[PDB]
Amino acid sequence: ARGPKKHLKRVAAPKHWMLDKLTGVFAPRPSTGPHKLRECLPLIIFLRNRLKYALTGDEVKKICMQRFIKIDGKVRTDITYPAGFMDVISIDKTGENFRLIYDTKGRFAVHRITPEEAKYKLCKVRKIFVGTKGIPHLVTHDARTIRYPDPLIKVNDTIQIDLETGKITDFIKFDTGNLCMVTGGANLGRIGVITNRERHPGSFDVVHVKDANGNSFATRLSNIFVIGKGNKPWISLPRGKGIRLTIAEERDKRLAAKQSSG
Amino acid sequence: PVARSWVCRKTYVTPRRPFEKSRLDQELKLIGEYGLRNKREVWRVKFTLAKIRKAARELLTLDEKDPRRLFEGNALLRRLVRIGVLDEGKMKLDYILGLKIEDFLERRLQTQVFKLGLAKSIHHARVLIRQRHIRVRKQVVNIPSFIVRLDSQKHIDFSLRSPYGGGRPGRVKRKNAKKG
Amino acid sequence: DTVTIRTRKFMTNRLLQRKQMVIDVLHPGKATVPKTEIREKLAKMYKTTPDVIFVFGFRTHFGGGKTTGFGMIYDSLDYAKKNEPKHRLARHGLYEKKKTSRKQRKERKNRMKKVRGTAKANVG
RNA sequence: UACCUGGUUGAUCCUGCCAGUAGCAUAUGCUUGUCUCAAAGAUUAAGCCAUGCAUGUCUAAGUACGCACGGCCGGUACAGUGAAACUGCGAAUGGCUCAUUAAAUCAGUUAUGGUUCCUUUGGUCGCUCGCACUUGGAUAACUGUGGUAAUUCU
RNA sequence: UGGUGACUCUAGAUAACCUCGGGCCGAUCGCACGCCGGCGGCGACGACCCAUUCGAACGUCUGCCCUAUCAACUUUCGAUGGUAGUCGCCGUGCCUACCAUGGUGACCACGGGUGACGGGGAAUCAGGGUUCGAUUCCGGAGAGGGAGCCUGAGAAACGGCUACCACAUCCAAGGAAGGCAGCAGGCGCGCAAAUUACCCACUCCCGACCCGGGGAGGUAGUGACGAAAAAUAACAAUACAGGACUCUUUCGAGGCCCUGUAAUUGGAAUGAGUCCACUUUAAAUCCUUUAACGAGGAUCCAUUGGAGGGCAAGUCUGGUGCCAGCAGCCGCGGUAAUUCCAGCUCCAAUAGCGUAUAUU
RNA sequence: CUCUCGGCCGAAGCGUUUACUUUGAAAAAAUU
């Protein structure tokens, strides 16, 4: 390598894109953007695989360049734009808004939201600096640099922000008894109430989180996204409530579904 | 770099002793009973049975309340029941070891044509299977190794396009009927 | 008479302004049906004219029963000219492909690369 | 399927190897009707290469005075499409081979509080107390004269 | 002010500096046009910096194959450390100057070799293990050998440049031009490996970009590398041959007995092929689907190895006669050859099967 | 196993240090 790589092979592509094995050698290289190449969803994969609107890459070209797709209320024409977590996608022609939220199994679900819900989003604050004549700045997980926040906002908190105005509206503090979602590791997509945060100066803060069914698990601190103040979440949720069904009881549900409709 | 897959398996294992009388004896007996082309078919069924038994051996050694043992074993027992080998009474992973090769050879579509009376010889069953005369539900199957399931066992028919079925007698009847 | 058209998964793309569907064809006696014939079948089925609709990718099933293809139904003809792949337009005579070979167009490109100025237009 | 069989002696019981047995991979022989996948100048020589191709690029949105065109309506600064050329970006991705290389490469793990970063995305873009109702000079494209046996030379 | 586990952090105050090879503070384009002579909405390009994304770059701990006929290695020409600097994007003997004499080693240092690019992984395998990994994914390295650069955010780049070396092309003999370990193709080397095809329709990438380009890639061609399925015949009646059962002292006779063998008879059913039409597709080809012709075995005919033991299947017939030869090993051949060579019969695997080598 | 700071508990030391075991989170896809 003499410079930045620009191609991505299909088998090296993030597994959660559920790409095939046999259509091609390459995968969409997500452009550089507000989200990591692994923790994201290129617009083409969301449009021609999840929704089946387009059938080729060229039909995604024909859709995105007509200016129907909007990510966070701004028209985005890039076909491989990195759309990520807590992300609002709006299509005005069909009049439908989805949110990208992690699935129970760790993938991205297509979660259809109310157009009332599409006006706001949640951003986990990532760092807080004070620059240029005492002006405070937040950097969130979408790289949204926000000047002049609430002084109570500290790192690892969440801020609910408005998409149109770009300003923060209200913040959820990182505290035990707050409903969080996991954004990485084996526990990805599981949603539960924070019980304990343990400190390791030097290394990574491991956090113990109790699920809705009483199945406690743990994560590193960076993989935690806070949503609910208390037990009530600040957003709508997928068809599963974020609880990880184990294999045998999932098969039980499958067999019950076959018995229900025949 | 290509958009292809090279994953492939060999579905038989040749025996280690090449010419021992009892092995050749048993294989030739099964060839006779179930009407097969060569010894590779018997080796194929024996290798599939060895696969199932090896899975059961790996599953017995685990503890009874192991979630992996439970899930894998119950799925395997469901699979062998749906083929038509095990019985609903003996759905235990212990009984999987008590399986024999002919319990899999009885489920071939060749033998299911033979037993159910669709044909009259097992070579006759094979020659009807190859020539597109036997269908399952609504699909004409041409393969004499189709392992027929229990729910699929009930209705095997004449493949209505066949002369034995709906109509259209073949080339021989058509030619002999236009002799004069 | 013995042919029947059924439609599996069906979807209205407002943002591609068409209707896509999966087409099942039943023809227990005949051959694989022509794409033209199924075009008038869908035209009478969806109450539109046959001049705007497109079908492709029909794989007849082993034996000779079902045939499954993909078919998409455009709103007006101009939208069909705008959005369809041009090889599916050239099956209806709506589009004509350039008749030069790649190897010829590339030798010509390197030839006119070797020249500078308006004399790039003269070479052929 | 946690396997063995022949061979030293007059015969036995051994040590013991040789040979058989099965695989898997390259070559090769002989033969080859159907059908679905599918490896393929690695080994020997990281030896040498005739020829063709493999890296280009324009939107309403940098520069149009090529009649090059159908074409405005005519003193209408510039209607449109637009070859060429300047400008900007790419050409550092991809492909290929395994010669080097033995704590090197590489793998898991940590670190940059020791640094660089096109692009993308969000911020910043009258904080500065000091001709603008529009600044200057070239140079291609084109015209015209040429050199050299010869070049993507000029 | 705010923050880390920890700042010589971020922020603030003051004194100053701010390179002529200089740092930012729009002399830019498009779209609709509109309100009290002046004010304006949307978009594109741009920009010092910050944060981000894509990374790159250095460090950390642990983990390599064979070799002692490699036991001491390093340090004059930096080897190990200290202080100050130089260069560097930075941390450092990275380099320089001055000091100190250190650093590694039987827990195998140093030197060699390697038919060594590493890993994910492959084959085998009860358990343990053994062997392999050039090879489509990841990381590395190099474009004939070395070296040095330009431009750029990113290169010590080679489908860029400049040199020397080694080859090598066109000459008008003055000069000019190279780089297939890219795709096809050739020579050469070999035991050993395909088309100088077609297309950007798929997958994705590049650009000023709903448009252009792509030997990346796709698609056909060669392809018994290897892998999956799977034809080369099925039924009935006769005609013999046996086997049991019954009746018969036996010989023999029957069966709504069995089992074989029939260039025997009868019909039906089919696919390999030739060919239309459709479908497939970028256009094709193939597979799949339809009409038409298409099968009696004396062919639309199955091979490759074998018949002494190991090791399945002949002490069958003729030829050669310790010759020719066979035979992995043990051995045979010297005249009834159970082993050679044929025929017949038979065995093993079966569209496959022999041999050689490597490895398990 | 405990003495201080805060709301019966949370902070702070733990305990001579390790080997061992068990759990937890991190550990590329393909292959298995």
Short mmCIF file of N, CA and C (backbone and C1' of nucleotides) in Angstrom, two decimals, chain D residues 25 27 31 33 36 40 43-45 48-49 51-53 57 61 87 92 94-96 98-99 102 106 113 115 121 124 131, chain E residues 4 27 29 43 48 51 63 89 116 134 141 154 180-183 185-186 188 191 193 208 212 215-216 224 226 272 286 351 357:
data_model
loop_
_atom_site.label_atom_id
_atom_site.label_comp_id
_atom_site.label_asym_id
_atom_site.label_seq_id
_atom_site.Cartn_x
_atom_site.Cartn_y
_atom_site.Cartn_z
P A D 25 -6.15 -33.34 -2.02
"O5'" A D 25 -4.97 -33.53 -3.06
"C5'" A D 25 -4.22 -32.39 -3.55
"C4'" A D 25 -2.80 -32.78 -3.84
"C3'" A D 25 -2.33 -32.53 -5.27
"O3'" A D 25 -1.73 -31.25 -5.35
"C1'" A D 25 -1.43 -34.55 -4.31
P A D 27 -0.44 -32.07 -13.14
"O5'" A D 27 0.60 -33.04 -13.86
"C5'" A D 27 1.91 -32.58 -14.23
"C4'" A D 27 2.82 -33.74 -14.54
"C3'" A D 27 2.31 -34.74 -15.56
"O3'" A D 27 2.47 -34.32 -16.93
"C1'" A D 27 3.08 -35.90 -13.66
P U D 31 -6.59 -45.64 -26.25
"O5'" U D 31 -7.93 -45.53 -25.40
"C5'" U D 31 -8.81 -46.63 -25.32
"C4'" U D 31 -9.90 -46.43 -24.31
"C3'" U D 31 -10.92 -45.35 -24.60
"O3'" U D 31 -11.88 -45.72 -25.56
"C1'" U D 31 -10.27 -45.22 -22.34
P G D 33 -16.99 -41.18 -26.35
"O5'" G D 33 -18.49 -40.67 -26.36
"C5'" G D 33 -18.99 -39.82 -25.34
"C4'" G D 33 -20.49 -39.94 -25.25
"C3'" G D 33 -21.21 -38.96 -24.34
"O3'" G D 33 -21.37 -37.66 -24.89
"C1'" G D 33 -22.00 -41.10 -23.91
P U D 36 -24.58 -28.74 -17.81
"O5'" U D 36 -24.66 -28.13 -16.34
"C5'" U D 36 -25.84 -28.24 -15.58
"C4'" U D 36 -25.53 -28.21 -14.11
"C3'" U D 36 -24.36 -27.33 -13.73
"O3'" U D 36 -24.66 -25.95 -13.67
"C1'" U D 36 -24.10 -29.41 -12.70
P A D 40 -6.46 -21.26 -10.33
"O5'" A D 40 -5.68 -21.98 -11.51
"C5'" A D 40 -4.39 -22.54 -11.30
"C4'" A D 40 -3.96 -23.27 -12.54
"C3'" A D 40 -3.74 -22.40 -13.76
"O3'" A D 40 -2.44 -21.85 -13.81
"C1'" A D 40 -5.14 -24.21 -14.31
P U D 43 7.39 -21.98 -11.61
"O5'" U D 43 8.30 -22.91 -10.69
"C5'" U D 43 8.70 -22.48 -9.40
"C4'" U D 43 8.91 -23.64 -8.46
"C3'" U D 43 9.87 -24.72 -8.95
"O3'" U D 43 10.66 -25.18 -7.88
"C1'" U D 43 7.80 -25.70 -8.41
P U D 44 12.24 -24.95 -7.93
"O5'" U D 44 12.55 -24.96 -9.49
"C5'" U D 44 13.75 -25.54 -9.98
"C4'" U D 44 13.82 -25.52 -11.48
"C3'" U D 44 13.83 -24.17 -12.17
"O3'" U D 44 15.11 -23.57 -12.13
"C1'" U D 44 12.50 -25.74 -13.38
P A D 45 15.40 -22.30 -11.20
"O5'" A D 45 15.54 -21.09 -12.22
"C5'" A D 45 15.11 -19.78 -11.86
"C4'" A D 45 14.31 -19.13 -12.96
"C3'" A D 45 12.95 -19.75 -13.25
"O3'" A D 45 12.04 -18.72 -13.64
"C1'" A D 45 14.28 -19.86 -15.19
P C D 48 14.54 -11.34 -17.02
"O5'" C D 48 14.48 -11.59 -18.58
"C5'" C D 48 15.66 -11.54 -19.36
"C4'" C D 48 15.38 -11.86 -20.80
"C3'" C D 48 14.43 -10.92 -21.51
"O3'" C D 48 15.06 -9.73 -21.93
"C1'" C D 48 13.85 -13.14 -22.01
P C D 49 14.18 -8.41 -22.08
"O5'" C D 49 13.45 -8.60 -23.47
"C5'" C D 49 12.13 -8.12 -23.65
"C4'" C D 49 11.38 -8.95 -24.66
"C3'" C D 49 10.05 -8.39 -25.11
"O3'" C D 49 10.19 -7.37 -26.09
"C1'" C D 49 9.86 -10.71 -24.70
P U D 51 6.86 -4.67 -31.01
"O5'" U D 51 5.43 -5.32 -31.26
"C5'" U D 51 4.79 -5.19 -32.52
"C4'" U D 51 3.38 -5.72 -32.48
"C3'" U D 51 2.41 -5.02 -31.55
"O3'" U D 51 1.91 -3.80 -32.08
"C1'" U D 51 2.19 -7.35 -31.30
P G D 52 1.49 -2.62 -31.08
"O5'" G D 52 0.04 -3.02 -30.60
"C5'" G D 52 -1.04 -3.09 -31.52
"C4'" G D 52 -2.26 -3.72 -30.91
"C3'" G D 52 -2.73 -3.12 -29.60
"O3'" G D 52 -3.47 -1.93 -29.77
"C1'" G D 52 -2.71 -5.47 -29.43
P C D 53 -3.33 -0.74 -28.71
"O5'" C D 53 -4.06 -1.29 -27.42
"C5'" C D 53 -5.46 -1.45 -27.43
"C4'" C D 53 -5.93 -2.33 -26.30
"C3'" C D 53 -5.76 -1.77 -24.90
"O3'" C D 53 -6.76 -0.85 -24.53
"C1'" C D 53 -5.00 -3.99 -24.95
P U D 57 -12.21 9.08 -21.09
"O5'" U D 57 -12.78 10.07 -19.98
"C5'" U D 57 -13.74 9.63 -19.00
"C4'" U D 57 -13.81 10.58 -17.84
"C3'" U D 57 -14.26 11.99 -18.19
"O3'" U D 57 -15.68 12.03 -18.20
"C1'" U D 57 -12.37 12.08 -16.76
P A D 61 -23.40 23.52 -17.11
"O5'" A D 61 -22.98 24.78 -16.24
"C5'" A D 61 -21.78 24.75 -15.50
"C4'" A D 61 -21.89 25.43 -14.17
"C3'" A D 61 -20.82 25.04 -13.18
"O3'" A D 61 -19.60 25.70 -13.43
"C1'" A D 61 -22.93 25.13 -12.11
P U D 87 -2.50 23.71 -17.34
"O5'" U D 87 -3.81 23.90 -16.46
"C5'" U D 87 -4.05 25.13 -15.75
"C4'" U D 87 -5.40 25.12 -15.08
"C3'" U D 87 -5.64 24.02 -14.07
"O3'" U D 87 -5.01 24.28 -12.82
"C1'" U D 87 -7.56 24.26 -15.40
P A D 92 -0.24 4.68 -10.15
"O5'" A D 92 -0.21 4.07 -8.69
"C5'" A D 92 -1.19 4.43 -7.72
"C4'" A D 92 -0.74 4.05 -6.34
"C3'" A D 92 -1.82 4.04 -5.28
"O3'" A D 92 -1.40 3.16 -4.23
"C1'" A D 92 -0.25 5.66 -4.73
P G D 94 -5.28 -2.29 -3.56
"O5'" G D 94 -5.79 -2.87 -4.94
"C5'" G D 94 -7.19 -3.19 -5.09
"C4'" G D 94 -7.53 -3.28 -6.56
"C3'" G D 94 -6.90 -4.45 -7.32
"O3'" G D 94 -7.56 -5.67 -7.04
"C1'" G D 94 -6.69 -2.49 -8.59
P G D 95 -6.71 -6.93 -6.60
"O5'" G D 95 -5.89 -7.33 -7.90
"C5'" G D 95 -6.52 -8.14 -8.91
"C4'" G D 95 -5.67 -8.09 -10.16
"C3'" G D 95 -4.34 -8.84 -10.11
"O3'" G D 95 -4.43 -10.22 -10.41
"C1'" G D 95 -3.97 -6.68 -10.93
P C D 96 -3.84 -11.30 -9.41
"O5'" C D 96 -2.66 -11.96 -10.24
"C5'" C D 96 -2.31 -11.52 -11.55
"C4'" C D 96 -0.84 -11.25 -11.61
"C3'" C D 96 0.02 -12.07 -10.67
"O3'" C D 96 0.21 -13.38 -11.18
"C1'" C D 96 0.75 -9.81 -10.68
P C D 98 5.19 -17.45 -7.80
"O5'" C D 98 6.07 -16.88 -6.61
"C5'" C D 98 7.45 -16.58 -6.80
"C4'" C D 98 8.09 -16.10 -5.53
"C3'" C D 98 8.06 -17.10 -4.38
"O3'" C D 98 9.27 -17.02 -3.64
"C1'" C D 98 6.98 -15.11 -3.72
P A D 99 10.55 -17.82 -4.16
"O5'" A D 99 11.21 -16.81 -5.20
"C5'" A D 99 12.53 -16.98 -5.66
"C4'" A D 99 13.29 -15.69 -5.55
"C3'" A D 99 13.76 -15.31 -4.17
"O3'" A D 99 14.89 -16.04 -3.75
"C1'" A D 99 12.83 -13.43 -5.21
P A D 102 16.40 -12.88 7.88
"O5'" A D 102 15.21 -13.51 8.73
"C5'" A D 102 14.81 -12.94 9.99
"C4'" A D 102 14.72 -14.02 11.03
"C3'" A D 102 16.07 -14.66 11.37
"O3'" A D 102 16.75 -14.09 12.52
"C1'" A D 102 14.29 -16.28 11.10
P C D 106 4.25 -7.12 9.15
"O5'" C D 106 3.31 -8.36 9.43
"C5'" C D 106 2.80 -9.20 8.38
"C4'" C D 106 2.46 -10.56 8.92
"C3'" C D 106 1.50 -10.57 10.09
"O3'" C D 106 0.14 -10.47 9.70
"C1'" C D 106 3.33 -11.93 10.63
P G D 113 -1.64 11.33 22.49
"O5'" G D 113 -1.07 12.22 23.70
"C5'" G D 113 0.31 12.64 23.65
"C4'" G D 113 1.02 12.42 24.96
"C3'" G D 113 1.50 11.00 25.28
"O3'" G D 113 2.74 11.10 25.98
"C1'" G D 113 -0.03 11.68 26.92
P U D 115 3.90 14.78 19.86
"O5'" U D 115 3.68 14.97 18.30
"C5'" U D 115 2.65 14.28 17.62
"C4'" U D 115 3.17 13.73 16.32
"C3'" U D 115 2.35 14.02 15.08
"O3'" U D 115 2.56 15.32 14.56
"C1'" U D 115 2.99 11.75 15.11
P U D 121 -20.06 15.56 2.76
"O5'" U D 121 -20.18 15.43 4.34
"C5'" U D 121 -21.12 14.53 4.94
"C4'" U D 121 -20.89 14.44 6.43
"C3'" U D 121 -20.95 15.76 7.19
"O3'" U D 121 -22.28 16.18 7.47
"C1'" U D 121 -19.07 14.54 7.89
P U D 124 -20.17 27.29 13.76
"O5'" U D 124 -18.67 27.68 13.42
"C5'" U D 124 -17.80 28.13 14.47
"C4'" U D 124 -16.46 28.53 13.92
"C3'" U D 124 -16.50 29.58 12.82
"O3'" U D 124 -16.72 30.90 13.31
"C1'" U D 124 -15.03 27.86 12.19
P C D 131 -7.10 55.03 -7.93
"O5'" C D 131 -8.07 53.82 -8.29
"C5'" C D 131 -9.09 53.42 -7.40
"C4'" C D 131 -10.15 52.60 -8.09
"C3'" C D 131 -10.99 51.73 -7.17
"O3'" C D 131 -12.08 52.43 -6.61
"C1'" C D 131 -10.19 50.43 -8.98
P U E 4 -12.51 13.06 33.35
"O5'" U E 4 -11.40 12.48 32.37
"C5'" U E 4 -11.07 11.12 32.38
"C4'" U E 4 -9.62 10.92 32.08
"C3'" U E 4 -8.81 10.26 33.18
"O3'" U E 4 -9.01 8.86 33.23
"C1'" U E 4 -7.61 12.08 32.28
P A E 27 -11.48 38.03 -2.47
"O5'" A E 27 -12.58 38.42 -3.55
"C5'" A E 27 -12.59 39.73 -4.14
"C4'" A E 27 -13.11 39.69 -5.56
"C3'" A E 27 -12.87 38.40 -6.32
"O3'" A E 27 -13.86 38.32 -7.36
"C1'" A E 27 -11.51 40.09 -7.22
P C E 29 -16.69 34.59 -12.55
"O5'" C E 29 -17.37 33.18 -12.79
"C5'" C E 29 -18.78 33.05 -12.72
"C4'" C E 29 -19.19 31.60 -12.70
"C3'" C E 29 -20.68 31.36 -12.76
"O3'" C E 29 -21.18 31.39 -14.08
"C1'" C E 29 -19.76 30.10 -10.99
P G E 43 -29.16 25.18 0.11
"O5'" G E 43 -28.30 24.89 -1.19
"C5'" G E 43 -28.61 23.78 -2.01
"C4'" G E 43 -27.97 23.88 -3.37
"C3'" G E 43 -26.48 23.70 -3.43
"O3'" G E 43 -26.08 22.35 -3.29
"C1'" G E 43 -27.10 25.48 -4.84
P C E 48 -6.66 25.47 3.78
"O5'" C E 48 -5.84 26.03 5.02
"C5'" C E 48 -5.06 27.23 4.93
"C4'" C E 48 -4.80 27.78 6.31
"C3'" C E 48 -5.07 26.83 7.46
"O3'" C E 48 -3.96 25.99 7.73
"C1'" C E 48 -6.14 28.87 7.90
P A E 51 -8.19 18.47 16.89
"O5'" A E 51 -9.49 17.57 16.76
"C5'" A E 51 -10.44 17.51 17.83
"C4'" A E 51 -11.80 17.18 17.28
"C3'" A E 51 -11.92 15.86 16.53
"O3'" A E 51 -12.04 14.75 17.41
"C1'" A E 51 -13.10 17.55 15.38
P G E 63 7.74 -16.02 24.41
"O5'" G E 63 7.09 -16.73 23.13
"C5'" G E 63 6.00 -17.66 23.29
"C4'" G E 63 5.39 -17.93 21.94
"C3'" G E 63 6.37 -18.13 20.78
"O3'" G E 63 6.92 -19.43 20.71
"C1'" G E 63 4.72 -16.59 20.14
P C E 89 9.75 15.91 7.81
"O5'" C E 89 8.32 15.75 8.48
"C5'" C E 89 7.71 16.83 9.17
"C4'" C E 89 6.74 16.32 10.19
"C3'" C E 89 7.36 15.84 11.49
"O3'" C E 89 7.53 16.90 12.42
"C1'" C E 89 5.84 14.22 10.67
P A E 116 10.89 -24.80 1.24
"O5'" A E 116 11.96 -23.87 1.96
"C5'" A E 116 12.07 -22.47 1.67
"C4'" A E 116 11.19 -21.70 2.61
"C3'" A E 116 10.76 -20.34 2.11
"O3'" A E 116 9.73 -20.56 1.16
"C1'" A E 116 11.42 -20.13 4.34
P A E 134 3.13 -20.80 1.06
"O5'" A E 134 3.94 -20.65 -0.29
"C5'" A E 134 4.50 -19.39 -0.69
"C4'" A E 134 4.27 -19.15 -2.16
"C3'" A E 134 2.85 -18.81 -2.57
"O3'" A E 134 2.56 -17.42 -2.43
"C1'" A E 134 3.68 -20.44 -4.03
P A E 141 6.18 -3.49 2.89
"O5'" A E 141 7.03 -4.31 1.83
"C5'" A E 141 8.33 -4.82 2.17
"C4'" A E 141 8.82 -5.80 1.12
"C3'" A E 141 8.89 -5.27 -0.30
"O3'" A E 141 10.12 -4.60 -0.53
"C1'" A E 141 7.82 -7.36 -0.31
P G E 154 2.51 14.12 1.08
"O5'" G E 154 2.04 12.60 1.02
"C5'" G E 154 1.96 11.82 2.22
"C4'" G E 154 1.35 10.49 1.85
"C3'" G E 154 2.06 9.78 0.71
"O3'" G E 154 3.19 9.09 1.22
"C1'" G E 154 -0.24 9.86 0.24
P C E 180 7.25 -4.80 -18.44
"O5'" C E 180 7.43 -6.10 -17.54
"C5'" C E 180 7.44 -7.39 -18.12
"C4'" C E 180 6.05 -7.97 -18.17
"C3'" C E 180 5.97 -9.47 -18.33
"O3'" C E 180 6.07 -10.12 -17.08
"C1'" C E 180 4.49 -8.41 -19.85
P A E 181 6.58 -11.65 -16.94
"O5'" A E 181 5.80 -12.15 -15.65
"C5'" A E 181 6.48 -12.32 -14.41
"C4'" A E 181 5.65 -11.81 -13.26
"C3'" A E 181 5.44 -10.29 -13.22
"O3'" A E 181 4.10 -10.01 -13.63
"C1'" A E 181 6.59 -11.02 -11.27
P G E 182 3.68 -8.55 -14.14
"O5'" G E 182 2.13 -8.45 -13.78
"C5'" G E 182 1.20 -9.25 -14.53
"C4'" G E 182 -0.17 -8.64 -14.42
"C3'" G E 182 -1.20 -9.13 -15.44
"O3'" G E 182 -1.97 -10.18 -14.89
"C1'" G E 182 -0.98 -6.78 -15.60
P C E 183 -2.09 -11.57 -15.65
"O5'" C E 183 -3.07 -11.22 -16.84
"C5'" C E 183 -4.43 -10.86 -16.59
"C4'" C E 183 -5.15 -10.71 -17.89
"C3'" C E 183 -4.76 -11.73 -18.95
"O3'" C E 183 -5.34 -13.03 -18.79
"C1'" C E 183 -4.70 -9.61 -19.91
P G E 185 -3.07 -17.45 -24.22
"O5'" G E 185 -2.06 -16.78 -25.24
"C5'" G E 185 -2.28 -16.83 -26.64
"C4'" G E 185 -1.11 -16.25 -27.39
"C3'" G E 185 0.21 -16.97 -27.21
"O3'" G E 185 0.33 -18.18 -27.91
"C1'" G E 185 0.57 -14.66 -27.00
P G E 186 1.26 -19.34 -27.29
"O5'" G E 186 2.74 -18.87 -27.66
"C5'" G E 186 3.13 -18.77 -29.01
"C4'" G E 186 4.42 -18.02 -29.20
"C3'" G E 186 5.65 -18.65 -28.60
"O3'" G E 186 6.11 -19.76 -29.33
"C1'" G E 186 5.67 -16.34 -28.17
P G E 188 12.00 -22.79 -27.99
"O5'" G E 188 12.82 -22.62 -26.65
"C5'" G E 188 14.09 -21.98 -26.64
"C4'" G E 188 14.46 -21.54 -25.25
"C3'" G E 188 14.40 -22.62 -24.19
"O3'" G E 188 15.54 -23.45 -24.19
"C1'" G E 188 13.33 -20.69 -23.39
P C E 191 12.23 -33.00 -18.12
"O5'" C E 191 10.87 -33.62 -17.57
"C5'" C E 191 10.09 -34.50 -18.36
"C4'" C E 191 8.68 -34.61 -17.84
"C3'" C E 191 7.87 -33.33 -17.85
"O3'" C E 191 7.23 -33.12 -19.09
"C1'" C E 191 7.67 -34.40 -15.74
P A E 193 2.58 -28.47 -19.51
"O5'" A E 193 1.43 -27.38 -19.59
"C5'" A E 193 0.07 -27.74 -19.45
"C4'" A E 193 -0.65 -26.76 -18.56
"C3'" A E 193 -0.42 -25.30 -18.89
"O3'" A E 193 -1.35 -24.83 -19.85
"C1'" A E 193 -0.06 -25.67 -16.58
P A E 208 -13.52 15.01 -9.48
"O5'" A E 208 -14.69 15.78 -10.25
"C5'" A E 208 -14.73 17.22 -10.30
"C4'" A E 208 -15.81 17.72 -11.23
"C3'" A E 208 -16.84 16.69 -11.71
"O3'" A E 208 -18.11 17.30 -11.92
"C1'" A E 208 -15.75 17.59 -13.57
P G E 212 -22.31 6.61 -21.30
"O5'" G E 212 -20.75 6.92 -21.21
"C5'" G E 212 -20.18 7.85 -22.15
"C4'" G E 212 -18.78 8.21 -21.70
"C3'" G E 212 -17.84 7.04 -21.42
"O3'" G E 212 -17.31 6.48 -22.62
"C1'" G E 212 -17.70 8.60 -19.66
P G E 215 -10.84 -3.48 -19.77
"O5'" G E 215 -10.76 -4.91 -19.07
"C5'" G E 215 -9.88 -5.06 -17.95
"C4'" G E 215 -9.32 -6.46 -17.88
"C3'" G E 215 -7.87 -6.54 -17.39
"O3'" G E 215 -7.74 -7.78 -16.71
"C1'" G E 215 -7.98 -7.30 -19.60
P A E 216 -6.73 -7.97 -15.50
"O5'" A E 216 -7.20 -6.91 -14.40
"C5'" A E 216 -8.58 -6.78 -14.08
"C4'" A E 216 -8.77 -6.37 -12.66
"C3'" A E 216 -9.81 -7.21 -11.94
"O3'" A E 216 -9.17 -8.28 -11.24
"C1'" A E 216 -10.46 -4.95 -11.87
P A E 224 -9.97 -32.87 -20.89
"O5'" A E 224 -10.49 -34.08 -20.00
"C5'" A E 224 -11.50 -33.88 -19.01
"C4'" A E 224 -11.09 -34.48 -17.69
"C3'" A E 224 -9.59 -34.63 -17.47
"O3'" A E 224 -9.25 -34.28 -16.13
"C1'" A E 224 -10.65 -36.72 -17.23
P G E 226 -7.64 -35.72 -11.18
"O5'" G E 226 -8.63 -35.11 -10.09
"C5'" G E 226 -8.36 -35.25 -8.70
"C4'" G E 226 -9.15 -34.28 -7.86
"C3'" G E 226 -10.61 -34.62 -7.63
"O3'" G E 226 -10.83 -35.61 -6.66
"C1'" G E 226 -10.45 -32.38 -8.25
P A E 272 -30.87 -36.65 -23.17
"O5'" A E 272 -29.57 -37.50 -23.49
"C5'" A E 272 -28.60 -36.98 -24.37
"C4'" A E 272 -27.66 -38.04 -24.88
"C3'" A E 272 -27.03 -37.72 -26.21
"O3'" A E 272 -25.95 -36.83 -26.10
"C1'" A E 272 -27.82 -39.94 -26.23
P C E 286 -26.52 -24.36 -27.04
"O5'" C E 286 -26.25 -24.78 -25.53
"C5'" C E 286 -25.10 -25.54 -25.18
"C4'" C E 286 -24.89 -25.59 -23.70
"C3'" C E 286 -26.05 -26.16 -22.91
"O3'" C E 286 -26.11 -27.56 -22.97
"C1'" C E 286 -25.25 -24.22 -21.83
P A E 351 -19.88 -45.53 -12.80
"O5'" A E 351 -19.81 -44.18 -13.63
"C5'" A E 351 -19.43 -44.16 -15.01
"C4'" A E 351 -17.98 -43.79 -15.11
"C3'" A E 351 -17.70 -42.33 -15.43
"O3'" A E 351 -16.47 -41.93 -14.84
"C1'" A E 351 -16.79 -43.68 -17.12
P U E 357 8.79 -44.52 -7.46
"O5'" U E 357 8.74 -43.06 -6.82
"C5'" U E 357 9.79 -42.12 -7.05
"C4'" U E 357 9.26 -40.71 -6.99
"C3'" U E 357 8.77 -40.23 -5.63
"O3'" U E 357 9.76 -39.88 -4.68
"C1'" U E 357 7.23 -39.58 -7.27
#
